[PDB]
Amino acid sequence: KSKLPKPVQDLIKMIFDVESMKKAMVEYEIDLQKMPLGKLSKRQIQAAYSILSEVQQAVSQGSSDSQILDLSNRFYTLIPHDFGMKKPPLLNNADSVQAKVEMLDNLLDIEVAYSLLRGGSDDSSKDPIDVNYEKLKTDIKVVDRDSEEAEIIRKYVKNTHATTHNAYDLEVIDIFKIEREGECQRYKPFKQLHNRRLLWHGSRTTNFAGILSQGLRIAPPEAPVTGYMFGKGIYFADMVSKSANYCHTSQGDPIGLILLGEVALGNMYELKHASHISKLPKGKHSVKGLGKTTPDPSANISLDGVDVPLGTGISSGVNDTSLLYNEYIVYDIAQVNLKYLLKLKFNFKT
């Protein structure tokens, strides 16, 4: 039976498991009993991205209101809601639409998770940890606990536990190091852009089955570039909080994955309200949301000339803005390299 170190095995059984896939889908409203995730298709999801984009032209451009209502009604058929009852939401504003843009994001990694699954195995020989983990195409080291490395890391969750989000408060269950296969290569280019930074990528867990196979990713062509504060790239945080929220760990599951990426920022476009891009102007190689808290300048460690902002909840001078913490974005995928995972226990304050 498996081989593997032991939270690697559990990591498999957490990130690879069927029940919870239904659970996300459920919380986006999705009507499992209409639309079973054997449905889930790259295909029917991609079509849905084009209808939410359909609604967007039209909303920012007047439109038949005899269009809008059916594009909503189109949005439904293809992605069946358990609603239900109660008065469904209209795709004729920015908000409700963006809402449905997350569900599809997620639908994407969840498909890739379950659809992942389906391959290897009447097997067995090679048991059900090493075949999933085998298909991850990723390798997983357990950082020892006592190490200055695990140490450093834990300062970083510490100090950038933020103010406002307390609360919950937070802790490190396991700490995995990762090379996924050949991502050195791709990043190669980007191993020599200036301004590189370890930042959090937090996501709902159900996601990491195909973030570990597909690498972190960006919305398809089909998707509303209005669906996203900075258009569609790849979003990242420096406070561990802004990211950790995205695990959607609740009172139970309270337990939840988070990435630490190397990211090749170079020249930061600094921004404060939304910019709907996907094209970055010339000479600029990432977007920055300029939230009012910065990780205190002061403390900024750098192993191999990546910066790490494990510095603590300080106030930036931006009052003026739409954010309260920073938000780094990069618009293609090569500019990222996954370094650590961490398993988190959410520990929800009293």
Ligand X SMILES: Cc1cccc2c(=O)[nH]c(CCCN3CC=C(c4ccc(F)cc4)CC3)nc12
Q: Is 327 in the active site?
A: yes
Establish whether 261 is an annotated binding residue: no
CB neighbours of residue 224 within 10 Å: 25
Least distance in Å: CB of 22 to ligand X? 17
Helix (H, G, I), strand (E, B) or coil at 199: strand
Establish whether 38 is an annotated binding residue: no
CA atoms within 13 A on the CB side of 103: 23
Report if residue 197 touches ligand X, rule: CB under 6 A: no
Question: Which of 196, 199, 329 minimizes the C-alpha distance to 264?
Answer: 196
Please confirm whether the linkage preceding 50 is cis (ω < 30° from 0). Answer: no
Q: Which segment (21-29, 56-64, 195-203, 267-275) binds ligand X by CB under 6 A?
A: 195-203
Q: What is the DSSP string of 105-134?
A: HHHHHHHHHHHHHTSS-S--SS-SSTTHHH
Backbone φ and ψ of 347, nearest 5°: -145, 95
Report if residue 114 touches ligand X, rule: CB under 6 A: no
Binder of ligand X out of 75, 156, 187, 235 (CB under 6 A): 235
Cβ pair 269, 287 in contact under 8 A: yes
Report if residue 226 touches ligand X, rule: CB under 6 A: no
Binder of ligand X out of 108, 129, 198, 287 (CB under 6 A): 108
Least distance in Å: CB of 200 to ligand X? 6
Binder of ligand X out of 200, 208, 340, 346 (CB under 6 A): 200
Binder of ligand X out of 242, 285, 288, 343 (CB under 6 A): 242
Least distance in Å: CB of 143 to ligand X? 21
Report if residue 233 touches ligand X, rule: CB under 6 A: no
Report if residue 109 touches ligand X, rule: CB under 6 A: yes
Cβ pair 308, 197 in contact under 8 A: yes
Helix (H, G, I), strand (E, B) or coil at 42: helix
- Interacting residue ranges for ligand X, rule: CB under 6 A: 105-106, 108-109, 200-203, 207, 217, 219, 235-237, 242-243, 246, 327
Residues annotated as binding site for NAD(+)?
201-203, 210, 217, 243
